[PDB]
């Protein structure tokens, strides 16, 4: 129903970003919300048929607009580390008391002090224990994705060139490598469980890949290490006798 662009947004402090939202066809009201851990789902601003309807506890830097095509734009200027939150958009028919709100998938913003601290993940596959295979006749492949910053990642398991979901479970939230640091690099684990016989087949190819979201081609980089661009990092393993 309600659509939102972009999905992920990694930026620096002082930058300006623009968020878009296309409401449900037939809906003439659009609402903007900021969701953070310590403040919850907080209303920013509302529009009806291209005009401002309501203002929340919105900042001076934050500005919005509803075009004649009824889509909305939330412009966020002079960004601060605190602006790192989930920005949801909502759509309503007439914006009256009995109208039901319908939310969008939301843009996820991450404001960093500098782009220098951005690191892609280190993906490593770990083959199942011979003890587990001998005890349950089930084999667990563990995938470890370490040292990445920030946490805009998507982990997936691939058996013989195709994605798998059966016997797969990834941590809902990553760990902090240095929990005392506010800008700490992250770690994430995932498991792929198959039967002992399936893993025992050497013709079976297993691969764990992590999609990392980072800096785009237009961003600056002068450091000796390779630019941490949005990329795919992967580790693979074949079946053992």
């Amino acid at each position: 129903g309600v659509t939102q662009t972009p999905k992920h947004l990694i930026t620096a402090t002082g930058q300006r970003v623009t968020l878009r939202c296309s409401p449900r066809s037939g809906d003439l009201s659009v609402y903007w919300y900021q969701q953070s851990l310590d403040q919850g789902l907080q209303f920013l601003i509302q529009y009806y048929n291209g005009e401002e309807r309501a203002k929340g506890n919105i900042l001076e830097r934050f500005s919005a607009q509803q075009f004649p095509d009824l889509h909305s734009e939330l412009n966020l200027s002079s960004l601060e580390l605190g602006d790192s939150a989930l920005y949801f958009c909502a759509s309503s028919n007439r914006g009256l008391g009995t109208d039901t709100q319908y939310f969008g998938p939301g843009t996820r913003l991450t404001v960093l002090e500098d782009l220098k601290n951005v690191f892609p993940p280190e993906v490593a596959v770990f083959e199942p224990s011979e003890a587990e295979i001998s005890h349950t006749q089930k084999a667990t492949l563990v995938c470890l994705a370490t040292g990445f910053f920030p946490d805009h990642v998507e982990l997936s398991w691939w058996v013989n060139g195709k994605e798998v979901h059966s016997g797969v479970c990834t941590d809902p939230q990553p760990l902090k490598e240095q929990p005392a640091l506010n800008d700490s690099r992250y770690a994430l684990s995932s498991r792929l469980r198959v039967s002992a016989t399936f893993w025992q087949n050497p013709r079976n190819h297993f691969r764990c890949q992590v999609q990392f979201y980072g800096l785009s081609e237009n961003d600056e980089w002068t450091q000796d290490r390779a630019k941490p661009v949005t990329q795919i990092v992967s580790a693979e393993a074949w079946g053992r006798a």
């Binding site: 083959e127 199942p128 224990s129 003890a131 005890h135 667990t140 580790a235």
Partner: peptide
């Protein structure tokens, strides 16, 4: 059970 996986 706690199992030791094969070192990468």
């Amino acid at each position: 059970a706690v199992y030791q996986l094969r070192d990468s």
